[PDB]
Scaffold this active site. Sequence first.
Site, PDB file in Angstrom:
ATOM      1  N   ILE A  88       1.066  -1.214  -0.108  1.00 22.09           N
ATOM      2  CA  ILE A  88      -0.087   0.511   0.106  1.00 22.09           C
ATOM      3  C   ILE A  88       1.210   1.310   0.198  1.00 22.09           C
ATOM      4  CG2 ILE A  88      -1.498   1.160   1.526  1.00 22.09           C
ATOM      5  CD1 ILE A  88      -2.665  -1.171   2.451  1.00 22.09           C
ATOM      6  N   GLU A 112      -2.409  -9.325   2.637  1.00 20.84           N
ATOM      7  CA  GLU A 112      -1.859 -10.161   3.196  1.00 20.84           C
ATOM      8  C   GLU A 112      -2.800 -11.370   3.427  1.00 20.84           C
ATOM      9  OE1 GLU A 112       1.483 -10.323   3.687  1.00 20.84           O
ATOM     10  OE2 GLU A 112       1.711  -8.534   5.310  1.00 20.84           O
ATOM     11  N   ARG A 148      -2.564 -12.898  -0.298  1.00 24.27           N
ATOM     12  CA  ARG A 148      -1.603 -13.030  -1.016  1.00 24.27           C
ATOM     13  C   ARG A 148      -1.363 -14.627  -0.114  1.00 24.27           C
ATOM     14  NH1 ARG A 148       2.335  -8.570   2.166  1.00 24.27           N
ATOM     15  NH2 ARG A 148       2.835  -7.491  -0.104  1.00 24.27           N
TER      16      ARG A 148
HETATM   17  N1  CDP Z   1       4.803   1.355   1.920  1.00 21.85           N
HETATM   18  C1  CDP Z   1       4.833  -0.142   2.269  1.00 21.85           C
HETATM   19  C2  CDP Z   1       6.042  -0.627   2.758  1.00 21.85           C
HETATM   20  C3  CDP Z   1       5.723  -2.223   2.950  1.00 21.85           C
HETATM   21  N2  CDP Z   1       4.044  -2.676   3.636  1.00 21.85           N
HETATM   22  C4  CDP Z   1       3.887  -4.292   3.682  1.00 21.85           C
HETATM   23  O1  CDP Z   1       4.027  -4.250   4.811  1.00 21.85           O
HETATM   24  C5  CDP Z   1       4.995  -5.739   5.001  1.00 21.85           C
HETATM   25  C6  CDP Z   1       6.362  -5.767   5.125  1.00 21.85           C
HETATM   26  O2  CDP Z   1       7.405  -5.100   4.944  1.00 21.85           O
HETATM   27  P1  CDP Z   1       8.834  -5.119   5.297  1.00 21.85           P
HETATM   28  O3  CDP Z   1       8.755  -6.501   5.718  1.00 21.85           O
HETATM   29  O4  CDP Z   1      10.191  -3.617   4.874  1.00 21.85           O
HETATM   30  O5  CDP Z   1       8.437  -4.863   6.739  1.00 21.85           O
HETATM   31  P2  CDP Z   1       9.364  -5.528   8.028  1.00 21.85           P
HETATM   32  O6  CDP Z   1       8.775  -6.000   9.043  1.00 21.85           O
HETATM   33  O7  CDP Z   1      11.050  -5.214   8.035  1.00 21.85           O
HETATM   34  O8  CDP Z   1       9.660  -3.514   9.223  1.00 21.85           O
HETATM   35  C7  CDP Z   1       5.358  -6.172   3.046  1.00 21.85           C
HETATM   36  O9  CDP Z   1       5.422  -7.083   2.440  1.00 21.85           O
HETATM   37  C8  CDP Z   1       4.023  -4.780   2.423  1.00 21.85           C
HETATM   38  O10 CDP Z   1       2.828  -5.907   3.024  1.00 21.85           O
HETATM   39  C9  CDP Z   1       2.795  -1.896   2.668  1.00 21.85           C
HETATM   40  O11 CDP Z   1       1.952  -2.101   2.654  1.00 21.85           O
HETATM   41  N3  CDP Z   1       2.938  -0.663   2.396  1.00 21.85           N
END
Ligand code: CDP
Length: 246
Positions: free
Chosen positions: A71, A160, A163
């Site tokens: 998002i 999610e 997915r």
């Molecule tokens: N701008 C963003 C960034 C992440 N996300 C969501 O957050 C999830 C996790 O991103 P990440 O692995 O970088 O999160 P962290 O656990 O590393 O903080 C992604 O797979 C997306 O589902 C999003 O919706 N929009």
Amino acid sequence: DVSFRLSGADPSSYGMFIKDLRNALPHTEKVYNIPLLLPSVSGAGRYLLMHLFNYDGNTITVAVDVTNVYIMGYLALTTSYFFNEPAADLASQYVFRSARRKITLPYSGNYERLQIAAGKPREKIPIGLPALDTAISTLLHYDSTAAAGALLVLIQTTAEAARFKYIEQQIQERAYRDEVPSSATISLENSWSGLSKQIQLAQGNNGVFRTPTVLVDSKGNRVQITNVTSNVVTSNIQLLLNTKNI
Ligand SMILES: Nc1ccn([C@@H]2O[C@H](COP(=O)(O)OP(=O)(O)O)[C@@H](O)[C@H]2O)c(=O)n1
Ligand SMILES: *[C@@H]1O[C@H](CO)[C@@H](O)[C@H](O)[C@H]1NC(C)=O
């Protein structure tokens, strides 16, 4: 575009939404019978608009990057909001340009940063259809601390669930009562990239992962996924992040 209304929602209408969300994401190949999201899409076509309506019929439009189901931001009445990250800044060149003003949220969109802003991990934040209705409501008027929590709900109940069928089922089971996500749900969220990569590396490796993926199962037991015969691959995962984006 795809749409979901909370007014009159039930497990069936939610599942139809999540099916529409999946079907709106472009792909030219399947890998082990799972749609492979594209390496890249240029311009406006990169972003899917999800129109979400709360129980009272108020609405936000959420912009989703179709290559990774991230998002990017959302529109609430005449104000647009975007995550504080380059991918969202790029998206703001294409979507909601007609907003009277644009706010950059004071955080990026990844779970770690959102949890920091919200003040709690997502293990402690109930999700469900009622939680989604609250999230939409919250996002209608700017409050950045409240929005972080709302967005953690929104991400889990849209992206999610698209997915992972298991996650979609978990929300369906919370159609009328919120509950914090299962640890399995958390595990799958956190493993989506890794799974997506290993399923793709399996193609020239006789269906065997180059590197095992550790998940938590339905019972809270931690398990290793080593090949494409696992039910996570045959039954659960519905979308693969392209290795070119990993
Ligand atoms: N701008 C963003 C960034 C992440 N996300 C969501 O957050 C999830 C996790 O991103 P990440 O692995 O970088 O999160 P962290 O656990 O590393 O903080 C992604 O797979 C997306 O589902 C999003 O919706 N929009
Ligand atoms: C493949 O995965 C199945 C299903 O989990 C498991 O029983 C099997 O032992 C694994 N085999 C290999 C060769 O990795």
